[PDB]
Design an enzyme around this catalytic site. Structure first.
Site, PDB file in Angstrom:
ATOM      1  N   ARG A  34       0.834  -1.192   0.000  1.00 24.18           N
ATOM      2  CA  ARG A  34       0.000   0.000   0.000  1.00 24.18           C
ATOM      3  C   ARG A  34       0.873   1.247   0.000  1.00 24.18           C
ATOM      4  O   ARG A  34       1.744   1.405   0.863  1.00 24.18           O
ATOM      5  CB  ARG A  34      -0.938   0.017   1.207  1.00 24.18           C
ATOM      6  CG  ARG A  34      -1.612   1.361   1.440  1.00 24.18           C
ATOM      7  CD  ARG A  34      -2.385   1.361   2.746  1.00 24.18           C
ATOM      8  NE  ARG A  34      -3.024   2.642   3.016  1.00 24.18           N
ATOM      9  CZ  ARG A  34      -2.675   3.461   3.999  1.00 24.18           C
ATOM     10  NH1 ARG A  34      -1.685   3.167   4.826  1.00 24.18           N
ATOM     11  NH2 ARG A  34      -3.342   4.600   4.162  1.00 24.18           N
TER      12      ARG A  34
ATOM     13  N   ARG B  24      -6.831  20.667   5.477  1.00 26.91           N
ATOM     14  CA  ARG B  24      -5.531  20.932   6.077  1.00 26.91           C
ATOM     15  C   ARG B  24      -5.429  22.385   6.513  1.00 26.91           C
ATOM     16  O   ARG B  24      -5.882  23.290   5.811  1.00 26.91           O
ATOM     17  CB  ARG B  24      -4.397  20.604   5.099  1.00 26.91           C
ATOM     18  CG  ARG B  24      -3.418  19.569   5.621  1.00 26.91           C
ATOM     19  CD  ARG B  24      -3.687  18.194   5.030  1.00 26.91           C
ATOM     20  NE  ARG B  24      -2.586  17.270   5.279  1.00 26.91           N
TER      21      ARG B  24
ATOM     22  N   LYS C 216     -12.881   3.492   1.405  1.00 26.03           N
ATOM     23  CA  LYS C 216     -12.513   3.639   2.807  1.00 26.03           C
ATOM     24  C   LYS C 216     -13.621   4.397   3.526  1.00 26.03           C
ATOM     25  O   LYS C 216     -13.935   5.536   3.164  1.00 26.03           O
ATOM     26  CB  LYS C 216     -11.181   4.377   2.955  1.00 26.03           C
ATOM     27  CG  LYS C 216     -10.001   3.702   2.280  1.00 26.03           C
ATOM     28  CD  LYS C 216      -8.809   4.646   2.194  1.00 26.03           C
ATOM     29  CE  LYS C 216      -8.353   5.092   3.578  1.00 26.03           C
ATOM     30  NZ  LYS C 216      -7.119   5.926   3.507  1.00 26.03           N
TER      31      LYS C 216
ATOM     32  N   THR D 180      -5.451  -0.173  10.529  1.00 23.05           N
ATOM     33  CA  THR D 180      -4.963   0.922  11.366  1.00 23.05           C
ATOM     34  C   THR D 180      -4.813   0.553  12.838  1.00 23.05           C
ATOM     35  O   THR D 180      -5.782   0.164  13.502  1.00 23.05           O
ATOM     36  CB  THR D 180      -5.856   2.156  11.225  1.00 23.05           C
ATOM     37  OG1 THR D 180      -6.087   2.418   9.834  1.00 23.05           O
ATOM     38  CG2 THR D 180      -5.181   3.361  11.853  1.00 23.05           C
TER      39      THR D 180
END
Ligand SMILES: [Mg+2]
Ligand SMILES: [Mg+2]
Ligand SMILES: [Mg+2]
Ligand SMILES: [Mg+2]
Ligand SMILES: [Mg+2]
Lengths: 512, 493, 519, 519
Positions: free
Chosen positions: B60, B107, B232, B290
């Protein structure tokens, strides 16, 4: 759109999974007990008060370390913090005190009053070096170690940090090769996987610690490194007559405990899956197998089981757990653990309060996610046909609680037994156990779903009015705690005569 | 006394738990795919080679960081490492390459033009008082900054959790229906770069609705139509609209990192088990991701919670498990891969196949598709005779995927001549893909035989089975079937 | 849906499955439960036998506790004459099995006034004499009854009860001679020739295989019968004795043990292990044991035969009233359907076809009920439980068989086509009880006839020459099954069927399952 | 474990449950399935009814097809005389209900040669003239048959089939007149008086409540009957008309709807919602719909009634052969057992008790079979499925009832004792089908009699005075229930029973369960 009740109605476990809903909020009541190890980070009265408010139900004292003076002060602080809330019998929470024995621990000596892979290390039994340890000489306390290890044996040091292989076996000494490298401190734990260690189940140290626990009126004993049923009997014998009511929780921490689990469970009041040492004695990838086996067999036998160690380990240094740690807590509840435990997270960590709050939040969500349809059916099929009226009363109360989605099962109990028998069948609804026995109230935290309430009202002259008084006491607590409200339906368990052993009456009543 | 076969015969799940045996060793074959995020710790050819040996099936690449040159070099190293074994198709292991998009990330800016201010609880933030965000488009809402470190509540903001605030950090808006584009201009560049680099799958970040998946798939174009799109699920909206997202996607990743910031952390396990259940029900791959072995970033051994998390993800029904920092930057990438391998194998044997297979069949429709019926018949035969493997000849992978959806205990050896099919097969639990490079034989019966014997040789060499064992072989019935419809129960030659 | 009770098939509980049963949901054409008919005066002619085959008869039962060897030889010729009348169309030809029912340790009466069909009317309270004088073995009448049990007075006493014809007539011994007995009729009724006599609680000492049985069993071997219904099997050793008489040529004859008394039920497991199949012979069983307990024994025996994968027959008085009436009673309709729901491979007719007034109607009625009941089976639970109760195997054919049944449920296939020489491969499919019919293609005529013993197996007898290219021979036989299924209405082009074949010539190598659209 | 099939009770699968059924495992004394007997000439005397009550009769069913209200009043008086003959022992007294069958849209023939008990023998091929001329209403014979449907010539044609007496005799119209039909009997048989006539496919528009029914129903209200069996209920409005005729004075009489034709089956759900219970009237049903479909309708109706918690009766031809024979057929034994296994609350006897030669033997046989089948029920699956199909409720009595049944299984209870005024609390327990008998103690005589409609309810009628202290009144009734099962052999010291009461005197608040050992 509540308590995952949509997932509750699924005809398959797969569909039950598919229906789990993050937008379906759980009930107020948390059924899984939270056990907190007390240490430097959590010893003060003020912190202990916040621990009780955050959800601590059992204070665990590890007699691995510390004097009887130290633990006596810890017990005093726990009870001072606990009784700080006594001015409100409605909101007062009983808090149990558990004594975790040292047991047959192996500990190193004092370093000079960094181990490297491949080096040679002598293990000395001569006490002249009991505090003169170095990179070439290591003293241990297991005097008969050479009789139980061989050149093929593995020796682990400091919670499995250091691995050693015996290369030459002497009569008073052992020569090993370092399989790690690493840094060795003083008085560290040593593990001998697969070895038949002949240390006593109850050492001379264990005898006074247990007698001290009897003197200090502790509620339960967490017996370390139980290897066979006779080990449990020795602990109960040491507790004697004055200690006969103390619950014996056997900690399974090595291969032998797993192999002899059935005889250990039959002799014990409960089990702790002590995954710290267990994960050093057996391959770490097999621990979940041992955990699920023991929780399953405890559920099947109806005895409490504790899942312990490293559940929220990262919160020793961080205010949030990892996703794996959140999963571990939830899956322990889904496995069927009566209690979950915190060790370093509360004993020495930087965020003990956050760790307690996190276990409370996760447990409540996981309890709603239980597939009660299959669990209750399988618990009943694996439980025998009985002639005990209280057992038949207990299963009828749990079935009635599912049929009406009751807000609670209210149980009057003196010893706790009647409430334990209800908890064994795992109702969704909380079990409000009303008792006048303070030890029964504290010990009730060992059992999934039992919310103990300690009635201090004087005994009423008419016994029927005394029973009514205690039932209404449970209603008032449940309403004030938000478990249910007027108009809701609850189930009430009582007996036909005064005393223990006569619970046989179930009533389905609206809340007044 | 092997592969928890005693627990497999239990009449109840409770008794199945009671029968789990630490002294019952699993089979050699590991069914759960291992996805490793490649980074500085795992970037070299030699490290990538050792990761393949340790069990890595999918590499990945996280395009939230790094230039196209950096990732092109990473891709080159992966292909250099992967192709080391190409001279021996028997021992060659396909390795997929996945592109994890940056997606609609929010961000912050630079602290006073630099690249830290300490925010204090209760203070006003609207520098320590001025915060700029790149999301150009209510009261009480929560805003989290830098992987959930700082918490803020819109007051007209107020700092709910304090901390040290850096530059250009991620921002999470729990419960908000953010209208950022599913594919940014950066994402278009990365996705077309992925098309040029022949990646096998796309991990699309922050998928919020079915239309988000369609937008991604359009960018992949004609050459990318066969690239698997894994959505996701990372926030509240993706969970609430999961069903339309799954039907529009090729698979799902439970992205627990962001999910645990967008929804209460104590609720993540609910979303994980819901999504794995629905993917199992639909027969689509699902990835658990994760912090599964987070502590192994610094330590050679995992915590007890981390071992449980990996095992329970397999027991949940996850097709793949994933490592992020453990392999991208940690000190023990090989140990992390090896540990996921060991736990998955133990957990795979601990699955209650009796209930799982029964429930998967009851929740799957009655069909007229001959391959769907062939697949479920092959799995039933595999349980009945405890076969060493199910061998499936396949061009697109579909026939092998249809077998994998019914979750046999035995490994699925999928023989293909399509390299992309072999690499993408790692998305599906139990499929061990092998790439046949022998020329197509004139007589079709000999081409099938050639490929079946190739699977036999692979299983023997890998230790999945040996001569005399019983396996099931799925092939077609004639030249040009186009569908797998023939099942044979054969001893291994 | 709205067909073959497919709505009830999808129910999550058996209770809801019951709630969804629909009288307006028509069943499929294929009938899975075999129908066994006892042949007698009412059904002996070639013309009637032709109509019996058309109405649904699969097995012809000849009861050798009555009749001569010559008489039965003509019956066998008539059955085969009627059966081969349809041979000019191999697509529609139906194999018809021949069953031999032994006398066994039976007590049997004589002939009423010299005939096997005559009857007299016994009246309540009247006096009846049981004589052992062989001068009366064919001179039975309303006042004199001869039986073959020579030591009958040694095991009966005054006041004892003697029952005749499956408990139809009850008699109470009033006086005990040395070689005769005089009795009182307690309930009246009409008495035929060569009827069974039951002495419940008496220690009857007759041999399991009599000298007559040796002759009858050897006669069956000579006449190439397909199965033997062995009467009054009480222990495994009884089955072994029968199998020994059958010898080597009879090794392929299926031995069906008839359970008719207390000992047979108590020793059922050892009897089942030694037998090829079981008949719940409820006629004698319902008088030997309490009548209220028969359904327990029936469901026990059907359950254990289903569990072991061996054929089980439910027999006797299923449509009893149709001996005189063209329509059955409500209890008889329920009995036939519940026998199928219990899991019986075959259902049987005795007097209804042997001597009754409506033999064709009785066959047709069993056909109609069986088809309706088969659609009403809760296959979801049945297939699940058969698999969990069946062991893990190393037999490739066993794994192939269970995979084929699962595939048949998954795609609701029109049929499972099985190529088989001995029948075993088709039997292994039938043990898992698919809804779809099992078309067993064989070149072995005995295999085709014996296949009727197993629920769901529709045998077809291929008469095409063996082809040199084995792949072409397999195709030839598979396409033959396609032609039969299309002609019978089981499926059409575009439907999906499952085909079981082998990897090599010979018996024992079925290992290939194909899910194919019908070409 | 060797009693009441407790070994089969523990099986993990239904298949293994069948395999474990044991003819040597005796059932308990208590019989849970109610027995309904139709009263007629064979069972009308006080002396015979006394033997019928002892043999197991719980409900006396009266069909008023012949005789005046005075004649039927004597039948009612005779039933109660026999019933109250046992009143001198409250320990052994059994309540006995009285059921009234409406005529409904039935077509009925006339009197055979002036008598209600006379019969003629019709022969196949003979001619039978159907007439509407009232001069032959009481002059029926082998050549002339009068019926009461005046519009019959309008709804049949030449070639139509006319069936008489539940399809026993079939007739084909050969000639049609304005007010007569000349038919040919297709099968022979015995033709009695006032028999039912079925015209399948004919568009009969008869009312749900005939004028005769209006008179009889008010007479039934005056005679204090407990329930009405309403014939040929086809839709919900039919039930409402019946309830309207019963009026206010009859509001407590239970209406049991008889499903006898296609429309009743197709509209079953709306009929069930309006009814107090259902009767599967298989006599008319098996001729109105294909006989091979009756078992589907029966199991559908029993399942849906079980699901709704309303009584269902299985009726007609259950032991039909026992009208003339002292022992039933094997199909009849199976039919009774399978009706109980289906979940029927009551089983019924019609001609077997009304006119047959062995009414007592028929009652005893239904008692014997029902007791055996009740032990053979797979309670593990049934209780699980009944609970899963029942909704989550807030009614405290419903939660109390299901908890008591679960407790009864946990301790293998000897009985569930339920105090009830209207019967509702005991009905709610019966809906979850415990193995243990439900001893319902009531002071309401109608509640005691009506309780027989529900599986497992053993009613006991307390006639002791109401005690001032309610706790002593509850105690009186609870221990009275003890004394009964005590004396009846239902349990002994050491057994455990479950006791259901309320918190105070009143109706509607049953919420207290006590687990007590038997003294
Ligand atoms: Mg300790
Ligand atoms: Mg430890
Ligand atoms: Mg993310
Ligand atoms: Mg017989
Ligand atoms: Mg009728």
């Amino acid at each position: 759109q509540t308590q995952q009740l949509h997932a509750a109605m699924a005809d398959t476990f797969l569909e039950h999974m598919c229906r789990l809903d993050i937008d379906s909020p759980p009930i107020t009541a948390r059924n899984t007990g939270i056990i907190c190890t007390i240490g430097p980070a959590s010893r003060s009265v003020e912190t202990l008060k916040e621990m009780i408010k955050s959800g601590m139900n059992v204070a665990r004292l590890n007699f691995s370390h510390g004097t009887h003076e130290y633990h006596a002060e810890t017990i005093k602080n726990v009870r001072t913090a606990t009784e700080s809330f006594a001015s409100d019998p409605i909101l007062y929470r009983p808090v149990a005190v558990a004594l975790d024995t040292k047991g047959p621990e192996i500990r190193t000596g004092l370093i000079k009053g960094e181990l490297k892979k491949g080096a040679t290390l002598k293990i000395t039994l001569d006490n002249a070096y009991m505090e003169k340890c170095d990179e070439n000489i290591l003293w241990l306390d297991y005097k008969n170690i050479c009789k139980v290890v061989e050149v093929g044996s593995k020796i682990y040091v400091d919670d499995g940090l250091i691995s050693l292989q015996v290369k030459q076996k002497g009569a008073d000494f052992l020569v090993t090769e370092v399989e790690n490298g690493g840094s060795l401190g003083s008085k560290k734990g040593v593990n001998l996987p697969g070895a038949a260690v002949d240390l006593p189940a109850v050492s001379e140290k264990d005898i006074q610690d247990l007698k001290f626990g009897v003197e200090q009126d502790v509620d339960m004993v967490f017996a370390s490194f139980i290897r066979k049923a006779s080990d449990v009997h020795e602990v109960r014998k040491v507790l004697g007559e004055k200690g006969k009511n103390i619950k014996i929780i056997s900690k399974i921490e090595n291969h032998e405990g797993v192999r002899r689990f059935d005889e250990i469970l039959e002799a014990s009041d409960g089990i702790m899956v002590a995954r710290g040492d267990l994960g050093i004695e057996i391959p770490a990838e097999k621990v979940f197998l041992a955990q699920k086996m023991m929780i399953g067999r405890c559920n099947r036998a109806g005895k409490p089981v504790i899942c312990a160690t490293q559940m929220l380990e990262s919160m020793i240094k961080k205010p949030r757990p990892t996703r794996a740690e959140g999963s571990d807590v939830a899956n322990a509840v889904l496995d069927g653990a009566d209690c979950i435990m915190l060790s370093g997270e509360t004993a020495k960590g930087d965020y003990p309060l956050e760790a307690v709050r996190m276990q409370h939040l996760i447990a409540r969500e996981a309890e709603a996610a239980i597939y009660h349809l299959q669990l209750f059916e399988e618990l009943r099929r694996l439980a025998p046909i009985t002639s005990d009226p209280t057992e038949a009363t207990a299963v009828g109360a749990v079935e009635a609680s599912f049929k009406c989605c009751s807000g609670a099962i209210i149980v009057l109990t003196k010893s706790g037994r009647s409430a334990h028998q209800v908890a064994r069948y795992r109702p969704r609804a909380p079990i409000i156990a009303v008792t006048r026995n303070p030890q029964t109230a504290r010990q009730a935290h060992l059992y999934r779903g039992i919310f103990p309430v300690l009635s201090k009202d004087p005994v009423q002259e008419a016994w029927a009015e005394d029973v009514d008084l205690r039932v209404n006491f449970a209603m008032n607590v449940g309403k004030a705690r938000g478990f249910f409200k007027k108009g809701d339906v609850v189930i009430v368990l009582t007996g036909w005569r005064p005393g223990s052993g006569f619970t046989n009456t179930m009533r389905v009543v609206p809340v007044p």
